[PDB]
Curated annotation (Swiss-Prot):
It is an enzyme of class 3 (hydrolase). This is Lysozyme C. It catalyses: Hydrolysis of (1->4)-beta-linkages between N-acetylmuramic acid and N-acetyl-D-glucosamine residues in a peptidoglycan and between N-acetyl-D-glucosamine residues in chitodextrins. The lineage of its organism: Eukaryota, Metazoa, Chordata, Craniata, Vertebrata. Substrate binds at residue 101. The keyword Protein biosynthesis does not apply. The gene is LYZ. Its main location: secreted. GO terms for biological process: cell wall macromolecule catabolic process; defense response to bacterium; defense response to Gram-negative bacterium; defense response to Gram-positive bacterium; killing of cells of another organism.
Length: 129
């Protein structure tokens, strides 16, 4: 599914991401925009042979099992395909574990390079939240 901006803002807020570990909702919408273009079906191969999955591009190297990242972790205890659903629950509850692990939103390269330090409130402008 490809979310509308305000549609994803609404879902992320409902799932308890607004201000999660002090990251405003705008940070999460900005990350999702630049990670996946709001597309739950997004998959991208990493150089080490891991793959990033779903609307928040969660990495098989640490967080999920995709059956082809040998010697990796599965710290969210899910198949990476669960991260590709039209329903963002699994991506949200895994992202909460990632952002809590000491590195904050710096784990998301697109957030670091395109959202961090910017006016991220612009990403929720116009939305009825
Ligand atoms: Au959730
Ligand atoms: Au994020
Ligand atoms: Au949802």
């Amino acid at each position: 599914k490809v979310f509308g901006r305000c549609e994803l803002a609404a879902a992320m807020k409902r799932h308890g991401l607004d201000n999660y570990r002090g990251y405003s909702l705008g940070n999460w919408v900005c990350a999702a925009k630049f990670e996946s273009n709001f597309n739950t079906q997004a998959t991208n191969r990493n150089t080490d042979g891991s793959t990033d999955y779903g609307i928040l591009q969660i990495n098989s190297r640490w967080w999920c099992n995709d059956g082809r990242t040998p010697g990796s972790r599965n710290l969210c205890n899910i198949p990476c395909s669960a991260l590709l659903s039209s329903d963002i629950t699994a991506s949200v509850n895994c992202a909460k574990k990632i952002v809590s692990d000491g590195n904050g939103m710096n784990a998301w390269v697109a957030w670091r390079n395109r959202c961090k330090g910017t006016d991220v409130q612009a990403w929720i402008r116009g939305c009825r939240l």
